[PDB]
Scaffold this active site. Structure first.
Site, short mmCIF file in Angstrom:
data_model
loop_
_atom_site.label_atom_id
_atom_site.label_comp_id
_atom_site.label_asym_id
_atom_site.label_seq_id
_atom_site.Cartn_x
_atom_site.Cartn_y
_atom_site.Cartn_z
N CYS A 106 0.67 -1.55 -0.21
CA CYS A 106 -0.19 0.14 0.87
C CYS A 106 0.43 1.29 -0.27
O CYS A 106 0.88 1.29 1.01
CB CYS A 106 -0.71 0.36 1.03
SG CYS A 106 -1.86 1.54 1.56
N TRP A 278 -8.45 6.32 -0.91
CA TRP A 278 -9.30 6.99 -1.94
C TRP A 278 -8.48 6.93 -3.22
O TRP A 278 -7.65 5.82 -2.41
CB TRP A 278 -9.71 9.12 -1.57
CG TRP A 278 -8.25 9.24 -1.67
CD1 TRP A 278 -7.06 9.59 -2.17
CD2 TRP A 278 -7.94 9.82 0.07
NE1 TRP A 278 -5.68 10.04 -1.13
CE2 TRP A 278 -6.70 9.59 0.17
CE3 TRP A 278 -8.93 9.49 1.16
CZ2 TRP A 278 -6.03 10.26 1.59
CZ3 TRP A 278 -8.43 10.24 2.71
CH2 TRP A 278 -6.77 10.39 2.78
C1 HEM Z 1 -6.51 7.34 1.94
C2 HEM Z 1 -5.91 6.79 0.39
C3 HEM Z 1 -5.25 5.59 -0.24
C4 HEM Z 1 -4.48 5.43 -1.05
C5 HEM Z 1 -4.48 6.87 -1.74
C6 HEM Z 1 -4.07 4.01 -1.63
C7 HEM Z 1 -3.80 3.75 -2.31
C8 HEM Z 1 -3.10 2.57 -2.82
C9 HEM Z 1 -2.97 1.54 -3.69
C10 HEM Z 1 -2.94 2.13 -5.46
C11 HEM Z 1 -3.00 0.00 -4.22
C12 HEM Z 1 -2.88 -1.13 -5.11
C13 HEM Z 1 -3.89 -1.23 -5.63
C14 HEM Z 1 -3.92 -2.17 -6.89
O1 HEM Z 1 -2.66 -2.31 -7.58
O2 HEM Z 1 -4.51 -2.98 -6.92
C15 HEM Z 1 -2.66 -0.50 -2.29
C16 HEM Z 1 -3.34 -1.82 -2.44
C17 HEM Z 1 -3.73 -1.47 -1.16
N1 HEM Z 1 -4.34 -1.36 0.36
FE1 HEM Z 1 -3.98 0.98 0.55
N2 HEM Z 1 -4.39 3.16 -0.28
C18 HEM Z 1 -5.53 3.69 0.60
C19 HEM Z 1 -5.84 3.26 1.40
C20 HEM Z 1 -6.41 2.33 1.97
C21 HEM Z 1 -6.94 1.95 3.59
C22 HEM Z 1 -7.64 2.72 4.30
C23 HEM Z 1 -5.96 0.46 3.20
C24 HEM Z 1 -7.07 -1.03 5.23
C25 HEM Z 1 -7.63 0.10 6.05
C26 HEM Z 1 -5.53 -0.09 2.86
C27 HEM Z 1 -5.02 -1.19 2.64
C28 HEM Z 1 -4.38 -1.81 1.46
C29 HEM Z 1 -4.29 -3.56 0.96
C30 HEM Z 1 -4.03 -4.00 1.88
C31 HEM Z 1 -3.79 -3.25 -0.10
C32 HEM Z 1 -3.11 -4.56 -0.86
C33 HEM Z 1 -4.61 -4.81 -1.19
C34 HEM Z 1 -4.68 -5.95 -2.20
O3 HEM Z 1 -3.60 -7.26 -2.79
O4 HEM Z 1 -5.21 -6.29 -3.46
N3 HEM Z 1 -5.26 0.88 1.98
N4 HEM Z 1 -3.15 0.58 -1.39
C1 LIG Z 2 -4.67 -12.38 -7.09
C2 LIG Z 2 -5.26 -10.90 -6.73
C3 LIG Z 2 -4.63 -10.64 -5.54
C4 LIG Z 2 -4.03 -9.65 -4.83
N1 LIG Z 2 -3.87 -9.14 -3.30
N2 LIG Z 2 -5.08 -9.15 -5.13
C5 LIG Z 2 -5.87 -8.45 -6.31
C6 LIG Z 2 -6.79 -7.48 -6.37
C7 LIG Z 2 -6.20 -6.47 -7.54
C8 LIG Z 2 -4.73 -5.81 -7.54
N3 LIG Z 2 -4.56 -4.74 -8.58
C9 LIG Z 2 -6.01 -5.15 -8.73
C10 LIG Z 2 -6.94 -5.13 -8.78
O1 LIG Z 2 -7.02 -4.75 -6.86
C11 LIG Z 2 -8.09 -4.19 -7.06
C12 LIG Z 2 -8.45 -3.26 -6.53
N4 LIG Z 2 -7.68 -2.17 -5.87
C13 LIG Z 2 -7.63 -0.82 -4.74
C14 LIG Z 2 -8.93 -0.26 -4.59
F1 LIG Z 2 -9.17 0.63 -6.25
F2 LIG Z 2 -9.46 -0.89 -4.17
C15 LIG Z 2 -8.07 1.10 -3.65
C16 LIG Z 2 -7.09 2.04 -3.68
C17 LIG Z 2 -7.46 2.83 -2.85
C18 LIG Z 2 -7.98 2.41 -1.32
C19 LIG Z 2 -8.66 1.10 -1.39
F3 LIG Z 2 -9.15 1.32 -0.28
C20 LIG Z 2 -8.93 0.26 -2.10
C21 LIG Z 2 -5.30 -9.72 -6.85
#
Ligand code: HEM
Ligand SMILES: Cc1cc(N)nc(C[C@@H]2CNC[C@@H]2OCCNCC(F)(F)c2cccc(F)c2)c1
Ligand code: HEM
Ligand SMILES: Cc1cc(N)nc(C[C@@H]2CNC[C@@H]2OCCNCC(F)(F)c2cccc(F)c2)c1
Ligand SMILES: C[C@H](O)[C@H](O)[C@H]1CNc2nc(N)[nH]c(=O)c2N1
Ligand SMILES: C[C@H](O)[C@H](O)[C@H]1CNc2nc(N)[nH]c(=O)c2N1
Ligand SMILES: [Zn+2]
Lengths: 407, 411
Positions: A106, A278
């Site tokens: 993140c 956001w």
């Molecule tokens: C407040 C503004 C926030 C911004 C700008 C932000 C930004 C991002 C971005 C760009 C990613 C990569 C997402 C992707 O490529 O799918 C990410 C991933 C992630 N974020 Fe943040 N985030 C925010 C808030 C949060 C909050 C509130 C949480 C949890 C309380 C959080 C937890 C996570 C987690 C667990 C991932 C990895 C998600 C996955 O494996 O799919 N984020 N975030």
């Molecule tokens: C296979 C697999 C593993 C893993 N850990 N995760 C995924 C979700 C994918 C990762 N990359 C695109 C898609 O994730 C889509 C969700 N993106 C993050 C978001 F837009 F929801 C978001 C942004 C800012 C704040 C927030 F709270 C949420 C797939």
């Protein structure tokens, strides 16, 4: 034991000691690095609870106090007698915030301590889940002035009474396979859309249909609910220079809200814990719009820009990519919906990393995810070495419940 | 055992078995991943096993494993090591070894080309003047008037580590950098330290923005000696833009031949500390890194100023807009001058085809995603969406520390 990370742009070197507290496995070994792979009882529970409570009592400067010792005693007694325990409200809040703090993928963690936590552990039905989620959506959206939030449903018990949000995000668009071979809407969501229809959803069959929620309470069969349309804030996409851009008919939703992860705190497992922040603009403009497997809009935009598409070396894909990302940012900013650009977000993350090294001894970070999907090396994170390791409390990906569930 | 990689755009899944042939360490453990860390004298005892592993691989590759020739070569090498504490590679072995070190280089996106490598055997070299002549010949051959040809020149191997051959330059061709009293830098800021060393050694610096550095060459562990590459052998490309006529007046140029000269080549336990190699550029190396890194030529602002972009806020994406135009200009300029270059789209597409072929014929292709994904437009290239496995195979190229840190000055 003590490990150094170097920034190659600034020569600043930081020393990581925090990694020594990492517990879980990375997937790498001394022989093979899996850095780019997306998915690399009473006896077990007390050490996990103790480890958490120790960090908590340390956090409030009461480590080794009578209240520390008394709570450890209380929790042990509860596990021995009930096979699990319940977190105090203070413990739950601390835990959720730290799960975010520990999320190595993140970029937005400078914000980690400003998280509104909605305790939904008193929820018992899928209708209850829907009401909690609507309130989260309305609170987090805040008419465009977005506020980070998490809503936490009841923890796992025996594993046969799980709360789950079947959706991957609270707000996403439907996808449908067309009788001519193409896909209408988001191709990512075809399978989920089909399950929705199969469970009774009346699909509008358009390109931007907000999906219904499929909610599972207490291990029961999931139920269908539609988010009130007036709670789902959406943004029409226009360009500040190209008047034709609006004619593509593109829009996106304002609230990014991940709903499929599992929150682990003190050995306890919260299988439904939707959270929202956001958007960083590239998520929408680069990935959602330009991935070949997604809305795949590069060709149409490049054509409207009349670029030379005959040769890759004209960089027509690159030119159109930038314009799409300019349009996304402009549209959100014009409509007063919170968004951050990749330059701003990565600059803040570097400041956050420095803070975390100074105050905590490190910051786990996954460079493969932190570096934005466009313009990588013109952002400061490209040049920053990062160590990736797993700390608890944590968020973990969990597989889609329709694979696991039995009806 | 089997490891799977998935492509998230195509859903193509591949199965790696080649990782079983890896023995050297990555830097990572089950508890920590060091995938973004840039940097994560042999005894007889350790040498024969390494020589045997290599010769077994070589004889397997020519379909002569277990032959009399294979067995006789093993005995011959074993006796050479017992008697002299080292051994000499046959020319065929050296060629195979250099090609395989390239094939095994997990950070190299250009590996579709690996079997087309011209190898210059410089193991008979004895002096720095000798090294200079061999390097000049390499440059001329590889440049080929713009039609670039991949090549490597291999100088004598390490003996006791007190007699190393080394090229002190990190690349055969690079531009000087000069720090000014006011804290500003003229030319390439990456090269300030090396430039100061050259000057101290007697180089008369022109003190301009694109001065080609001299070679600083160390033979047989002796103090290094300075040599100027004949200017007529150094092909350069003035940078201009197809639409923007003001782009030429930025005064940019770059050299056509990318030639890495600071790596160590290991073949069969032997160490080639001087092994300059060259291919051709991918455009982003110049247009993104060399021109736009804040710590390099750092031209984004000037370009954006001339484009009249809105520079008051980062969200106008002015940096990103200027970046693309600069990269168009580099590709256009090289192409117009008929100097070989590859764009990042073509290079990554060819890499995926290479990787799939390697999985099919070899059982794997170690790859380092952090380096393989280009430094601009990452996710609009197919490599972004491709899972990779990083592991170390020999023969190999390894980074070595700059020799000025370790050299014993003879005086
Ligand atoms: C407040 C503004 C926030 C911004 C700008 C932000 C930004 C991002 C971005 C760009 C990613 C990569 C997402 C992707 O490529 O799918 C990410 C991933 C992630 N974020 Fe943040 N985030 C925010 C808030 C949060 C909050 C509130 C949480 C949890 C309380 C959080 C937890 C996570 C987690 C667990 C991932 C990895 C998600 C996955 O494996 O799919 N984020 N975030
Ligand atoms: C296979 C697999 C593993 C893993 N850990 N995760 C995924 C979700 C994918 C990762 N990359 C695109 C898609 O994730 C889509 C969700 N993106 C993050 C978001 F837009 F929801 C978001 C942004 C800012 C704040 C927030 F709270 C949420 C797939
Ligand atoms: C023929 C055209 C070639 C192309 C387009 C190409 C492309 C690239 C690129 C873009 C990189 C990363 C460079 C950087 O960021 O500094 C790289 C790295 C590398 N390449 Fe290739 N390459 C080519 C030929 C070769 C040859 C001929 C060899 C050796 C025989 C080679 C061996 C390596 C090695 C060892 C690295 C890692 C370098 C390091 O650690 O600094 N490449 N290549
Ligand atoms: C610290 C460290 C470790 C390491 N392994 N390597 C480095 C050299 C860095 C890598 N990134 C920028 C600079 O390397 C600059 C040289 N780039 C490669 C090239 F241009 F020379 C080239 C291109 C194509 C073909 C070819 F033969 C040569 C530093
Ligand atoms: C295969 C590779 O790991 C995969 O495409 C990753 C790369 N980096 C990413 N980075 C972010 N932020 N989000 C992603 O979905 C991905 N996908
Ligand atoms: C810290 C980080 O590993 C470093 O900046 C890397 C990232 N990826 C790279 N990729 C290539 N091709 N060349 C590089 O120099 C780098 N630098
Ligand atoms: Zn790793």
């Amino acid at each position: 034991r003590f490990l150094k990370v170097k920034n190659w742009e600034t020569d600043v070197v930081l020393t990581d000691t925090l990694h020594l507290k990492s517990t879980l496995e990375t997937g790498c070994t001394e022989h093979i690095c899996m850095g780019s792979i997306m998915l690399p009882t009473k006896d077990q529970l007390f050490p996990l609870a103790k480890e958490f409570l120790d960090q908590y009592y340390s956090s409030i400067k009461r480590f080794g106090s009578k209240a520390h010792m008394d709570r450890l005693e209380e929790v042990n007694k509860e596990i021995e007698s009930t096979s699990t325990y319940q977190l105090k409200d203070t413990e739950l809040i601390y835990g959720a915030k730290h799960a975010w703090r520990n999320a190595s993928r993140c970029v937005g963690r400078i914000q980690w301590s400003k998280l509104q936590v909605f305790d939904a552990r008193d929820c018992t039905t899928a209708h209850g889940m829907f009401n909690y989620i609507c309130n989260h959506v309305k609170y987090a959206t805040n008419k465009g002035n977005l506020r980070s939030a998490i809503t936490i449903f009841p923890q796992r018990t025996d594993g046969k009474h799980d709360f789950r949000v079947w959706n991957s995000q609270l707000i996403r668009y439907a996808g449908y396979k067309q009788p001519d071979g193409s896909t209408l809407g988001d191709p990512a969501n075809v399978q989920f859309t089909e399950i929705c229809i199969q469970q009774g959803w009346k699909a509008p069959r358009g390109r931007f249909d907000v999906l219904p929620l499929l909610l599972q309470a207490n291990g029961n069969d999931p139920e269908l609910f539609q988010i009130p349309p007036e709670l789902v804030l959406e943004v029409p996409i226009r360009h500040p220079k190209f008047d034709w851009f609006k004619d593509l008919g593109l829009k996106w939703y304002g609230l990014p809200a991940v709903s499929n992860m599992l929150l682990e705190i003190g050995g306890l497992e919260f299988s439904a814990c939707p959270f929202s922040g956001w958007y960083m603009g590239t998520e929408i403009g680069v990935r959602d719009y330009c991935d070949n497997s997604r809305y795949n809009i590069l060709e149409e935009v490049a054509k409207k820009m009349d670029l030379d598409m005959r040769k890759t070396s004209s960089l027509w894909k690159d030119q159109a990519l930038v314009e799409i990302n300019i349009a996304v940012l402009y549209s959100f900013q014009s409509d007063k919906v919170t968004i951050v650009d990749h330059h701003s977000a990565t600059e803040s993350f570097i400041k956050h990393m420095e803070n975390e090294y100074r105050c905590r001894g490190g910051c786990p970070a996954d460079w493969v995810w932190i570096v934005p999907p466009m313009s990588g090396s013109i952002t400061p994170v490209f040049h920053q070495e990062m160590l990736n390791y797993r700390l608890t409390p944590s968020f973990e990906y969990q597989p889609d419940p329709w694979n696991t569930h039995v009806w």
